[PDB]
From a paper:
The mycobacterial repressor, DarR, a TetR family regulator (TFR), was the first transcription regulator shown to bind c-di-AMP. Recently, DarR, a 201 residue, TFR regulator of a putative MDR transporter, Ms5347, in Mycobacteria was discovered and represents the focus of this work. The DarR N-terminal domain consists of helices 1-3 and the dimer domain is comprised of helices α4-α9. In DarR, dimerization is mediated by helices α8 and α9, which interact with α8´ and α9´ (where the prime indicates the other subunit in the dimer) to form a four-helix bundle dimerization module.
Crystals of M. smegmatis DarR and M. baixiangningiae DarR were produced that diffracted to 3.56 Å and 1.60 Å resolution, respectively. The M. baixiangningiae DarR structure was solved by selenomethionine single wavelength anomalous diffraction (SAD) and refined to final Rwork/Rfree values of 18.5%/20.2% to 1.6 Å. Analyses of the electron density in binding pockets in the M. smegmatis DarR structure showed water molecules. But there was no evident density for a ligand. The distance between HTH motifs in the DarR-DNA complex (39 Å) is similar to that between recognition helices observed in the M. smegmatis DarR structure (41 Å), supporting that the latter structure adopts a DNA-bound-like state.
Numbering used by the authors:
A (entry chain B): 5 to 204
B (entry chain A): 6 to 109, 115 to 204
Write the structure that this text describes.
């Protein structure tokens, strides 16, 4: 279809919003990375910003589907959280472009020079932000009640967990370029350190 | 302790963090510093070279804070948590400088980059000071037999990550921050699941 020609734009922007950043990237930069005119780019997206919201949209959606299915597993909460976290990681190791461009907005928060339709849309994705972290909070108390899990502040570890989770995109920047199997091994081992602990 | 160079450094580190480095300029720096337009330029070559100063200044600060906590006569688990607590208190109280120590496309000169290489060594050594502690920590049986490079790496970025949900929370007293960084450490190293 033409979903073929739009995703190329959003993949390109996802990988161009990263090295340069939004404020330091223009439509043309996308046009050059994609090898396409600047007219059709504006044909599919009415704004230099609207494009970013779409890569945002896809970034959650893509993760939104991938990690949700582990909302029920074989073990207690501990065993539920490990697999879903492993997904979130391997996801972000190949979805990397779309995932840097879902937490970037914090750098554009204060200025917030924006249209009034984009204010509603972006916030609509902000309250949708809360959904994903709540999903990760829920699988926690399932193991805490079972005792197979340690116990710590539920308003802290979720912040600490998601943060420790996405903290790895500030060290995988010059590490990309391997097999998706080799990404899964790390996604497993790292969730081990963050979950099963580094002490005895 | 009103000092001119340092106040220029904080105004920069502040703007450098919240305002994008790209979209935070010397003029942008001037408005929050209350200094003359060319005053900044008197001691600092260019926007970048302030970054060198601010990076270097707040970089060696954290190292002084945490080093005393690597030379204790204890185990890997308890000293590493000790150092990581100082890491977080540095981060929570020095958030502008601390984020800018790993915040670096522009037309850069070799000399301003040579210092950047010098800075990067400091960053690679503070972290290695964290790697050595874990090396004993699993050599002494108080820590899981976990891959060394990754465990030190994960913890370190785990501490540097407490900034992005903390930049909108920083108003509390040091009594709170010391009581906070400790919990932020426990599930960082101890983990969970019994």
């Amino acid at each position: 279809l033409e979903i073929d020609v739009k995703t190329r734009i959003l993949d390109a922007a996802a990988d161009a919003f990263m090295v340069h950043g939004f404020a330091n990237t223009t439509i043309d930069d996308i046009a050059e990375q994609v090898g396409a005119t600047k007219g059709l780019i504006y044909y599919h997206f009415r704004s230099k910003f609207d494009i970013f919201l779409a890569v945002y949209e896809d970034g959650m959606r893509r993760v939104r589907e991938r990690v949700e299915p582990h909302a029920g597993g074989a073990g207690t909460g501990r065993e539920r959280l490990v697999a879903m976290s492993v997904a979130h990681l391997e996801n972000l190791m190949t979805e990397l472009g779309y995932h840097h461009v879902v937490h970037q907005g914090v750098r554009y928060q204060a200025s917030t020079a924006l249209k009034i339709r984009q204010r509603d849309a972006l916030a609509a994705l902000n309250e949708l932000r809360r959904d994903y972290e709540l999903m990760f909070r829920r699988v926690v108390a399932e193991g805490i009640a079972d005792g197979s899990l340690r116990v710590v502040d539920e308003a802290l570890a979720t912040r600490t967990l998601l943060s420790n989770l996405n903290a790895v995109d500030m060290w995988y920047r010059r590490i990309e370029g391997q097999t998706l199997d080799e990404i899964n091994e790390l996604a497993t081992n790292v969730v081990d350190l963050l979950i099963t602990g580094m002490a005895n």
